[PDB]
Assembly symmetry: C2
Homo-oligomer: 201 residues x 2
Amino acid sequence: DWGTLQTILGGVNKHSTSIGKIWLTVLFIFRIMILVVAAKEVWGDEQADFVCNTLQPGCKNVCYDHYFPISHIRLWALQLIFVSTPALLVAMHVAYRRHEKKRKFIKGKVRIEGSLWWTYTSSIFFRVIFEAAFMYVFYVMYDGFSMQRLVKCNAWPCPNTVDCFVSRPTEKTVFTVFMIAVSGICILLNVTELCYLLIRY
Amino acid sequence: DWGTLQTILGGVNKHSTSIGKIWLTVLFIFRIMILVVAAKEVWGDEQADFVCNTLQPGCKNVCYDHYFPISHIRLWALQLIFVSTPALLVAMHVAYRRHEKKRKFIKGKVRIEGSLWWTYTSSIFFRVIFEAAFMYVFYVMYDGFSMQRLVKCNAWPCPNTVDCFVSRPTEKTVFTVFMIAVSGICILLNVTELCYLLIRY
């Protein structure tokens, strides 16, 4: 039930008029499509085919870890999770509060644009707080903007400075580009919607 | 030319009357016979079949060394070398000084019993100084009087405390007994001759 149901509440009835309402969510899908291709495919090798040229037991495991603390595809994953949260927390805040107020005062819209159009504004703030909280780590945590073919790893139990080599560090980067590019694009659409709610107040 | 020539000068013409003159040298031969059996036969394995249960590169080499600094058969060897030295230094001091004084005053025995029976007394002192200098190390250097089946070796590059195992540590000990026993026997005969030169002065 992954993706089809998030839209049943995520793509709600009739919220705003900016052409960036759907655009942002079409990417949200696109962006989980690109990742549901990367993950199971290019990262399986991450640990397996990660070769350290040393016979020294401890080394290779320590050399992956010290170098791949939260692997990319689990970061990408967490991103799509956190940045998914505001989207579904709001949609949850709506289908609850709207169903509630309605079926309670029918037997016995200033607060529909009040309560909900307001939490949605802070959501849009949250979205870009996350989309940029990770975009940050993904750029600061991981030694520049990509990964090299080999790394020189000083992991504890290696003898002095040893070599190690990653698997397909280009294919791995390629997908770090797209996912970082679309991570920026999906930042602007998010900030344009935070901009439009700063223009008319 | 090993053994047969040391006797040509070692077992000289007519030195003393104690029945321990030949006895000591018959052992000297016996003792190089037992060692010329041990060495090439039981010690080849020392390093080869010395097994340390660890995958840790440095370890096994360091575990032999830290534990077998001057291997037994090279000690035994050095013994038979040093304790061989006084025997052949004297015999050398004789066949030289005797050949010299003779062929020099023939054309133009108070100093034969003086010079030579005196250096021979200090030789006998030297013999038992060596025979006991090593007998000492061989007992102090090597962790008791024999060797265990396995050792627990803390050699640097092992992970913590590792096991290792020696080759035929009994056959190795067996020959440490004989060679240490005959190292004691050959001490007493040496000291009995230093005793007989202390009795009549």
